[PDB]
Write a protein that binds this ligand. Structure first.
Ligand SMILES: Nc1ncnc2c1ncn2[C@@H]1O[C@H](COP(=O)(O)OP(=O)(O)NP(=O)(O)O)[C@@H](O)[C@H]1O
Ligand SMILES: Nc1ncnc2c1ncn2[C@@H]1O[C@H](COP(=O)(O)OP(=O)(O)NP(=O)(O)O)[C@@H](O)[C@H]1O
Ligand SMILES: [Mg+2]
Ligand SMILES: [Mg+2]
Ligand SMILES: [Zn+2]
Ligand SMILES: [Zn+2]
Lengths: 469, 464
């Protein structure tokens, strides 16, 4: 019996400490997006409710239709390190039992989480404002639960429930049980979770770091856009478009669907490479698919995109010839999905915990990328002439090519444009040319007579496998 | 300032797996080690000894021991160690590196499965035992941490609960490298002064091949990363001796690795034609309502070891960061080492203290540094000489850039005439410049220990 022994405890300042892991704020947001995906949500809505009385002038809301959380799961949310997703063969991104807390405390001072399950709706309130105002060094988290049908309290302690609800009304954007019930009603199905981050972090100028004004359809970083800054790093729409290698959950930003894209599908001459990783085999004792392709659309947006369990960890990583001053292998996008048995993510899921094995994987990627360069033989065809074939005659490299319809279609018909249905969530390849943000497309709108119906099996692209060496 | 009682409300809690979660912040293992080195420095230690005690029965084959002569810890501070986020150092105008109340735990759990910390203060000897082995063996999901205290003089237990003390000591004897109170007191006696702390990380993480990540065999004087060092690998990233040599911009604590002193070096003190630059940051001015010194110089000794070294509160956060012309294709500003000490009011470190929490303001600082580095290049005006000719004057006549310069005594002395070799006394910790060593050196071996530390004030350049 170890009841009398000391326990490691969380202090209020540890919320900020944990939040410090996210120097990439879109990574903090991706924590909540990953949680929604793990919850089997078919849909996550990322929108802002204007609130001029709250720091930043608006709340950041993550509404998903996933499995939600019963009171036990909601309580486990504040068990740092607790992750039921940490399971063998798990396809769930979450493993560290930390992402929600770290990301939410990076995004804003306070977050209030509304979750609904079979017949229970639970509110989880993490208010650093409450802690600072009332001088609390622990991390006290109200966790009231109502019956999702009767809306009556579900508690073994009416005193505790009253204190929790009064704290919510005092320190949250919602001053009454009626406003709280409105938030719950925003969860339309039998299950789902709404995470509202409010009192958002301000920059030096007093403006919120998240800019939702420049583009009402996007969550942007409040900061200038250098010529080399990447859309996935300045635009959360662009980030969420590639956040997952297997996009199944629909992402909506300010009510506008994010056009998720598989980076492999948008490349010229893709060649998959089966790398028999000694790391993977050693931890099996206890293969990887490198997909390389030329980004004719944006030769600037080249680099390795390393996913870990379908979730983007590294983006625009330069490997192999991309590291040298010569542009050889320039414009090539590499994508690899690394399972947990090969690599684990860092604390913020923006890097890999095992630096040595990540370096080994990057070296393997560089070797296979050089092999891909030799295989496609566009150097044998002439690299600059190949680029000119798609309108890249500008002396500069990064900025896009001449957008005249000639080269536009030359690139388009070399890129099989795929789309996802808004109802069955399956991905289809279209035989025509799209006109333009995404639509509410469904399988019924596919002119392809072979797959024009909803029940049609997903015709899966099979990248032509290449052999290393 | 609470309106009511919150005893019944749920508290966020640490689970056993959160130890690993926290440890995952350190993809850089030497950063995990630097957490303990920073703690020793914050404890005002004059020296920290980083040595390996061979233990074939423990995973990795040896224990990693951090022995410092700092202020140590009374039982209250030792208890506060496991209060995640608790940092008494997090105070206004604090020179102490620690602010997040996390470094020890994150770094120790990154380095090894278990760590046992022995700390001594006025008359108390406290042991803090963080044993993930114990938790795994006994199915503990919380983080239970034994924290027995002995009277440093009588060696008697200091506890308000003899049952708790007995359980803590039995857990230590069962799951730690030290199976008896005699061995525990032997560890305590390794703290020779009235105060100090000994942190022993054991059951070290193994690589895939079953070897420990920390290689203490290739170089018995160094703690190395167990891995091949490609041409571009940096010594500070593969050698912990090299890392600790530059871990702090103000080296005052002596660092010994395997009993061998680390020759700490101020990167700004060994550059050719250094020019400090006064940069005023609106963030600094604001949070003062609540200047930065960019030092640029040419690394003639190793022009390949060039880049910005960003220190935060005297502690290295970013190393070899490329800014300004260093990012383009060409050797303009090549070989330039830039050093800046950013106070906490200007930037805060990330969770692992290997990056800066405010990415936007870090980018602003890097842009300012690049502008000032271009200014430095125009100021020294190597066009007077030509970049290649200037490099050749110091032995860089090889067509390649990365490879070191000529070892001929001519060029060696040519370089030495530009970099006044500075030395730190082993008795008073003061730094002296000699006109013209591994074991030790004092002011008498030049001057005396009572002489004021002459400061090498860099010339001041002008930006625009
Ligand atoms: N949107 C959500 N829907 C359902 N359950 C959720 C949601 N967000 C969080 N949870 C639950 O709360 C737990 C804690 O979240 P989090 O702190 O992100 O840990 P994790 O997701 O398990 N692991 P990681 O994200 O790698 O730290 C999750 O593991 C889920 O059980
Ligand atoms: N070697 C040491 N000597 C004395 N006190 C120490 C030592 N190591 C740790 N401590 C104490 O234990 C506390 C917790 O250590 P740590 O987890 O490193 O947090 P911190 O050093 O306060 N801040 P950070 O390193 O930024 O997380 C310190 O703040 C000190 O009070
Ligand atoms: Mg998560
Ligand atoms: Mg510390
Ligand atoms: Zn369909
Ligand atoms: Zn002296």
């Amino acid at each position: 019996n170890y009841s009398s022994l000391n326990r490691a405890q969380l202090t209020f300042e540890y919320l900020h400490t944990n939040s410090t892991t996210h120097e990439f704020l879109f990574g903090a947001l991706a924590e909540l997006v990953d949680n929604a995906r793990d919850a089997d949500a078919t849909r996550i809505d990322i929108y802002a409710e204007r609130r001029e009385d709250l720091r930043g002038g608006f709340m950041l809301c993550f509404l998903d239709d996933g499995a939600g959380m019963d009171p036990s799961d909601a309580a486990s949310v504040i068990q740092f390190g607790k992750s039921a997703k940490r399971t063998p063969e798990s396809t769930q991104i979450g493993q560290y039992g930390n992402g929600l807390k770290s990301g939410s405390m990076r995004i804003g001072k306070d977050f209030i989480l509304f979750t609904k399950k079979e017949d229970t709706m639970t509110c989880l309130f993490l208010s650093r404002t409450f802690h600072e105002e009332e001088g609390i060094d622990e991390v006290i988290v109200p966790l009231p639960t109502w019956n999702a049908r009767t809306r009556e309290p579900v508690t073994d302690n009416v005193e505790k429930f009253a204190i929790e609800t009064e704290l919510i009304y005092k320190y949250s954007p919602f001053r009454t049980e009626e406003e709280v019930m409105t938030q719950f009603m925003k969860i339309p199905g039998d299950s789902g979770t709404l995470v509202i981050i409010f009192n958002l972090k301000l920059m030096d100028n007093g403006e919120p770091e998240l800019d939702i004004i420049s583009n009402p359809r996007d969550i942007q970083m409040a900061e200038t856009s250098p010529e080399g800054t990447k859309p996935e790093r300045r635009s959360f729409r662009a980030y969420a478009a590639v956040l997952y290698i297997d996009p199944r959950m629909r992402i909506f930003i300010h009510g506008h669907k994010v056009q998720t894209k598989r980076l492999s599908c948008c490349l010229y001459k893709p060649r998959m490479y089966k790398y028999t990783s000694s790391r993977f085999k050693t931890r099996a004792e206890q293969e990887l698919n490198f997909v390389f392709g030329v980004n004719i659309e944006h030769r600037d947006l080249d680099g390795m995109f390393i996913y870990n369990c379908s979730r983007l960890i590294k983006m625009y990583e330069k490997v192999g010839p991309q590291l040298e001053g010569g542009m050889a292998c320039g414009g090539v996008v590499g994508v690899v999905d690394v399972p947990y048995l090969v690599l684990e993510p860092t604390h913020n899921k923006q890097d890999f915990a095992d630096a040595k094995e990540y370096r080994h994987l990057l070296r393997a990627m560089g070797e296979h990328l050089a092999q891909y360069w030799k295989d496609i033989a566009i150097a044998q065809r002439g690299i600059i002439k190949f680029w000119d074939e798609f309108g890249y005659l500008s002396a500069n490299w990064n900025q896009p090519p001449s957008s005249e319809l000639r080269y536009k279609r030359r690139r388009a018909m070399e890129i099989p444009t795929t789309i996802q249905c808004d109802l069955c969530l399956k991905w289809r390849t279209l035989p025509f040319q799209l006109s333009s943000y995404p639509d509410t497309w469904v399988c019924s709108m596919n002119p392809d007579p072979e797959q024009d119906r909803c029940e049609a099996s997903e015709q899966k692209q099979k990248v032509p496998l290449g052999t290393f060496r």
